[PDB]
Amino acid sequence: MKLIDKLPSFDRNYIVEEIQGAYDTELNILKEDIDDTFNQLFVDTATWGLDMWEDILCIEKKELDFDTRRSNIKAKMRSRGTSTIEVIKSICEAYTKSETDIKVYSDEFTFVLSFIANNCDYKTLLDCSDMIERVKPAHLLHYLEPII
Template identity: 35%
Template sequence: MFNKYLPSFLLDNKELVEILKVSNSEIKSIDNLIQDLYEQCFIKTATWGLKFWEENLDLKTDISKTYEERRSIILAKLRGQGTTTKKMIQSVAESFVDGIVKVIEKNKDYAFTINIESVKGFPYKLDSLYNAIDEIKPAHLGTEYNLKSTTKDKVRFASITRCAETITVYPWTPKETHVKGKIYIPTTNTNDFETTTIYPKGGN
């Protein structure tokens, strides 16, 4: 971490390099702790810090529930403060599902319907959702739920065509063997020269 801020000639010092290694390790650990603490300040990333959110909102801490469900309960509690309206009910329901939520009022029947369409399914039981809605809705109104889970996946089809051919070769021995071919034998003509000298020269 500090290496890039130092002159290159200092990195030739073995003792300094070892000190930097230890320092970098400690600083990295501190940085991880700071990042972890920072994440506890936000509901959607908090883990061990959820209990402080729950204490602040007078919610019971139930460690048997997943982090995701506990976060949803906390968000629902925050969104459910104030006068109950159609928009509030929708917002509270959206705390528990990742999808489309619609609230349909049925004033003549003194009830309302919550239509929930999720594209990722429902990762846990929705008892916490039902309890959160019951807590904020007017006591004289009934509630109906229509849950729809639409999941998407890739399906691949493949086909293979297999064919085979069998060739049977029976033993066969030829009686005669004939070989045909052309043989070229190159020849050449040579020229010979001979000179004869008779001694002594001259005389009759």
């Protein structure tokens, strides 16, 4: 309807109306595609574009939900760093499933964690120790101590 308004008066026949109606339907399709792509640009409004966001994050996860994917993307970015000892203690006590006391000496640069042996298994203890070392500073050394 836009072009026929722009088009001259003597071209007001039915053929022009039909062709311009088809072109206007094509315009609507194109503009809704443009809007969908612009939504895909933003993380919140993207639906199928989150795959490349995950690829940039270098983490591969099976598709579960768009909101879940966005939450995982938000979690992957920053949200790192243990501000104090309490962060590491709280993270480790989840694996140990028991209270843990720390005896840390600045002169020794030594970290020690005491936990009940019966509560936490050997394999999960090794996994928790590897995760701690992944978090624990290179100079510091953490000691896993099972209470007998």
